[PDB]
Design an enzyme around this catalytic site. Structure first.
Site, PDB file in Angstrom:
ATOM      1  CG  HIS A 268     139.365 -37.970   3.563  1.00 46.75           C
ATOM      2  ND1 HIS A 268     139.536 -38.063   2.186  1.00 46.75           N
ATOM      3  CD2 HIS A 268     138.093 -37.577   3.814  1.00 46.75           C
ATOM      4  CE1 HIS A 268     138.352 -37.774   1.651  1.00 46.75           C
ATOM      5  NE2 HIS A 268     137.456 -37.463   2.587  1.00 46.75           N
TER       6      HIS A 268
ATOM      7  N   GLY B 236     130.660 -35.043   1.660  1.00 52.88           N
ATOM      8  CA  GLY B 236     130.085 -36.382   1.764  1.00 52.88           C
ATOM      9  C   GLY B 236     130.174 -37.195   0.481  1.00 52.88           C
TER      10      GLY B 236
ATOM     11  CB  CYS C  20     134.935 -38.240   0.187  1.00 53.40           C
ATOM     12  SG  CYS C  20     135.209 -36.476   0.361  1.00 53.40           S
TER      13      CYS C  20
END
Ligand code: M7X
Ligand code: M7X
EC number: 3.4.19.12
Lengths: 304, 304
Positions: free
Chosen positions: B41, B143, B145
């Site tokens: 993503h 953030g 991730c």
């Protein structure tokens, strides 16, 4: 979101861990620059630990008796000295992995991470609070002596604790990095009274603010209280008296949530008087006191 | 003694963390050898996240669009490919800090440490369990991730999780290091059902063994039960059914304490039926299920 008992990343501290052996005793040491810090009881045998005469025991030791191993490499010891309850072994090589660091004496109620070690090797990391009675409820076995507690401010490691002893009660005692014990403890195998402990009130309130930020709001009520009224309840439930300095440190969390500090005190007052009624707050069925207001903000804002 | 929610030392994983930016999105990547793994993503904008066509979005990206920074140094990207929900960015430099590592897909009920990161920088470390429903109750903000979960077997880091998403319920979802989601989750901003969760019965029993080893014995009783009887209680209280394989893994703890597994099941049965009566076990007022039998033995024997 979510809230966990989070420790600082241990990497910078793993790079400082060494094994220190003196005679038959092996423990952990902390290698910063050209000095290795370790508990002075490394010079004792079992027959000495009832009441060691550390000055006399150390006099029988020479630099070559202190075997310091940093994983594969042996360090050459060129000096030794006792400072309070720690031994400082001067080595001929500065630790290439030495981070920026400070030695700090933390206050009761403050938190830190512990890197538990055995034979100079790290086994795990966990978050602790220094109890108001200067003990720590750690997880340490024989050989863990010399494992340290620390905090990290971006690139600076502030070492605050070095593990020395487990008291007969199963709680832990240790020193700052200058070898001064936290609390009344002495480094000898004797039963020692840890004072009456209390719950860190400012930390429970900070954790209630963490609960509100993270969605757990069932405990919020229509009430408010005063510092005096709240302190009568704190007294009955063995919680630290709340002061204006504690209210002031809660300012940021009070502003973020819009819940005035005395209103949150009224929720804590009701939870103390009524319990949780079988409900949970942030996965806990008790009032958590191991998160300071700084910890809550750091965890909820993402500081690296 | 003492028992803590202990994480593995994060040092070996801190050395692999990088920041990955693609367009306006920044997240964390894992740099092992000459490959950087990160959630796919990273190629999306907010307008894409409702239902991204990842194949089409990736086609508009070239190696030079993926900015990978390892602290101070920028890495040169020479290849990119999507494998399930992860992107693998081939870089021209092997990570000098690459530890011995394995990619493993953990089972529900197993535990691991998470190194929470923001902008390629580690902020903290905590111990998690993969829920029976394949979610994790982490502590992650925007953030985070690309932060990973792992276990360590002396010198080998088995990476098992990469964080991708926070579901509307506040629970977390992610993938193994081949980009396969744990659970039914998909990487899109859509409400997604996490299955019915259950309590990890073998872990609660292991934690009751940890409690006995560490001195907390009030819950031990004069009773015993059978797997069938215990499972009727487990059913009513939404606990995982206990099998002989779970009993077998509890063998070492049963031997250490001398408490037969079915006798410990009878203590768990009484605690489920009666609650804790306002008492605690290892500082918890609820039944803890985030310690596996291996975790308990590792913590109680001192493995480094
Ligand atoms: C089980 C365990 C946990 N932590 C530490 C230990 N070690 C000790 O207490 C050894 C000791 C005895 C007497 C005085 C001192 Cl300063 C040190 C064991
Ligand atoms: C607060 C927070 C915690 N962890 C992660 C996040 N980030 C996300 O969820 C972003 C996202 C949205 C839709 C799908 C995916 Cl795969 C990713 C935020």
């Amino acid at each position: 979101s979510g809230f966990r008992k989070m420790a600082f990343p241990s990497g910078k501290v793993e790079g400082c861990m060494v094994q220190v052996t003196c005679g038959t005793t092996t423990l952990n040491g902390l290698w910063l620059d050209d000095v290795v810090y370790c508990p002075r009881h490394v010079i004792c045998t079992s027959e000495d630990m009832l009441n060691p005469n550390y000055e006399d025991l150390l006099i029988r030791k020479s630099n070559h008796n202190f075997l310091v191993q940093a994983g594969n490499v042996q360090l050459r010891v060129i000096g030794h000295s006792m400072q309070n309850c720690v031994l400082k072994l001067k080595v001929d090589t500065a630790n290439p992995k030495t981070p920026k660091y400070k030695f700090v004496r933390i206050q009761p109620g403050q938190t830190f991470s512990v890197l538990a070690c055995y034979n100079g090797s790290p086994s795990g990391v966990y978050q602790c609070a220094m109890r108001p009675n200067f003990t720590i409820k750690g997880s340490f076995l024989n050989g863990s002596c010399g494992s340290v507690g620390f905090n990290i401010d971006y690139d600076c490691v502030s070492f605050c604790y070095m593990h020395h002893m487990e008291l007969p009660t199963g709680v832990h005692a240790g020193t700052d990095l200058e070898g001064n014990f936290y609390g009344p403890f002495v480094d000898r195998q004797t039963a020692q009274a840890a004072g009456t402990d209390t719950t860190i009130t400012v930390n429970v309130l900070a954790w209630l603010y963490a609960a509100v930020i993270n969605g757990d709001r069932w405990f919020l009520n229509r009430f408010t209280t005063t510092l005096n009224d709240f302190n009568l309840v704190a007294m009955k439930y063995n919680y630290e008296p709340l002061t204006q300095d504690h209210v002031d440190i809660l300012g940021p969390l009070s502003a973020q949530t819009g819940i005035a500090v005395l209103d949150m005190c009224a929720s804590l007052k009701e939870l103390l008087q009524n319990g949780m009624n079988g409900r949970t707050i942030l996965g806990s069925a008790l009032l958590e006191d191991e998160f300071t207001p700084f910890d809550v903000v750091r965890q909820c804002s993402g500081v690296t």
